[PDB]
Design a protein around this ligand. Structure first.
Ligand SMILES: Nc1ncnc2c1ncn2[C@@H]1O[C@H](CSCC[C@H](N)C(=O)O)[C@@H](O)[C@H]1O
Ligand SMILES: Nc1ncnc2c1ncn2[C@@H]1O[C@H](CSCC[C@H](N)C(=O)O)[C@@H](O)[C@H]1O
Lengths: 325, 303
């Protein structure tokens, strides 16, 4: 990766140009017939002269084509910007999407490096969760993005662990219930509850009504820093811990160990340090969170009165099993 | 990849490192996360996470002891390095600072206005004009034109927005009997002072600190402005031209002299700027009378 050049590696022009085009849905406009800078500008609500400059830059990058008459077109590479593209990439870049909005926080990375605190608040004046809690567009956006994450690393998850033996599973920070949905469908005698904030919890309850699972699945609006529904055989922490600093992480794990007691299990499911540095920084900038190794996970577990008993690889992520220490 | 082309993590990681001058500290002897963070005044745990990302990028080396080192490429982060890249990335540096303005690029695309103000609340030229350091960083980080026009006939020429010594120094050097004055903001003008001073042009070269938007120093046989046109919107320009006119009065000629798609977007981000144009200047101001193309850059004379 050293074969690029210091400056080029630090370039912000191209990444932002791509993000602006994704946001302005430029690719969809030209595919719809709006081909000139003027046509695309009036269609996307932009300034023709300025938009043209951004298009020229993106042509140089190879996403678009421009003939001698100023008529633009999509290259096979540019087709990826279309909102209907099968790879679903435009969504991650749109500044209106949860992650598209959040990645701009990297502009304030110096603050996180100097303080260890999240950069997202320095840019938007509030926490990521608070923002999603106030805006259903952002919340729904983040949920959709997570569903995409579930597909990639969770397919066949029901077969990678003995979920049936749990009897009842509590998904702590379970989102809209996509994971619990997959588990209950495969294991018909299993029951479970989604514990999350109003937003996701409501979406999950809506999901259960829709797929006819409300009978075995329920929802609990609550904070995982507070006492959790006790008595369950297992508590799942799916892509949650990396969102928090050590202090908060142990707080969450501690509430899980509490609820699980001597008889239950706590399952942390996420990419152990074994994504990498890139996601780690994203976690730091967004929430002051972090990617951890199985060892760091063990250190956190001990502090909550828990112990790692096993770690099951399932894809890009792993399932780490913990029980009363 | 597309999501890769849009990555912001690595570019900012690079810029934060340059700003904290991690490479310099390392070369100085601080090779541990805690030691670098101590020298750079950062949070050790967080700094270590940034360095690990840069190790994977190929700028830094890290041994199983926790000691960090610089790779061939990492050497370029040295504020001492010959290529002088550090200046382009240091958030304290002219372009290292304005570049973060790219995060507001959407504003420029939707309106045509500079993004920089949306981030910093002040304009780019305002800040540079207020800090001779910041100013000098942008200039260093950036001839025959005289042998192409009859400057000598002007007698005295006011380089409007003449930045630092620049063109006037070359004009006065090509015409040993011409005199000139650089009109610009405090920042650039200071530099213009040191230059003309060392270049022994004290006798025929002078500097006046002021805005080219209010009454200008009249008299001069000609008022020249290069690389000052695009930095502004039409109005701004004609607004500036009006000043030259009121100081030229067709007794003098107002001259207007004028590669990188990424550089083009930087200009849009920084200034929201960019012959019928100079004519649009002729319309609401001094009338065009010629144009003389030199290489890439032309010279549109008025009066
Ligand atoms: N204090 C809190 N209490 C409960 N849930 C919270 C919370 N703060 C954040 N969350 C939830 O933690 C989740 C992290 S991201 C989604 C995780 C989900 N298990 C999945 O795999 O998709 C989000 O749903 C967020 O709403
Ligand atoms: N309001 C203002 N009044 C005077 N000079 C200004 C100004 N705003 C910007 N400038 C100057 O305009 C110049 C733009 S950079 C181009 C400089 C030009 N090529 C030259 O002859 O040196 C900078 O020096 C900037 O400081």
């Amino acid at each position: 990766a050293a074969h690029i050049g210091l400056r080029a590696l630090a370039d912000l022009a191209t990444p932002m140009a791509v993000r602006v085009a994704a946001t302005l849905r430029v690719a969809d406009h030209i595919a719809a017939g709006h081909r000139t800078a003027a046509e695309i500008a009036s269609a996307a609500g932009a300034h023709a002269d300025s938009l043209d400059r951004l298009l020229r830059h993106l042509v140089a990058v190879g996403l678009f084509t421009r003939d001698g008459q100023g008529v633009y077109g999509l290259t096979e590479f540019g087709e990826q910007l279309r909102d209907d593209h099968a790879a679903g990439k435009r969504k991650w870049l749109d500044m209106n999407s949860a992650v598209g909005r959040g990645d701009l926080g990297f502009v304030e990375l110096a603050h996180s490096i100097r303080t260890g605190q999240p950069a997202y608040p320095v840019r938007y004046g509030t926490s990521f969760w608070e923002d999603l809690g106030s805006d259903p567009v952002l919340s729904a956006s983040f949920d959709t993005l997570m569903s995409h994450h579930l597909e990639l690393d969770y397919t066949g998850i029901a077969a990678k662990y003995d979920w049936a033996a749990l009897g009842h599973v509590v998904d702590v920070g379970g989102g809209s219930g996509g994971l619990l949905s997959a588990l209950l469908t495969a294991h018909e005698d299993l029951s479970g509850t989604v514990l999350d904030l109003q937003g996701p919890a409501s979406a999950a309850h809506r999901r259960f009504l829709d797929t006819g699972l409300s009978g075995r699945a329920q929802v609990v609006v609550g904070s995982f820093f507070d006492p959790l529904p006790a008595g369950a055989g297992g508590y799942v922490l799916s892509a949650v811990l990396h969102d928090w600093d050590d202090l908060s992480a142990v707080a969450i794990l501690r509430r899980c160990a509490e609820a699980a007691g001597s008889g239950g299990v706590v399952l942390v499911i996420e990419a152990v340090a074994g994504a990498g540095t890139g996601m780690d920084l994203r976690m730091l900038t967004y929430f002051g969170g972090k990617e951890r190794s199985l060892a760091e996970l063990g250190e956190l577990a001990a502090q909550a009165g828990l112990a790692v008993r096993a770690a099951h690889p399932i894809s890009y992520v792993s399932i780490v099993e913990m029980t009363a220490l």
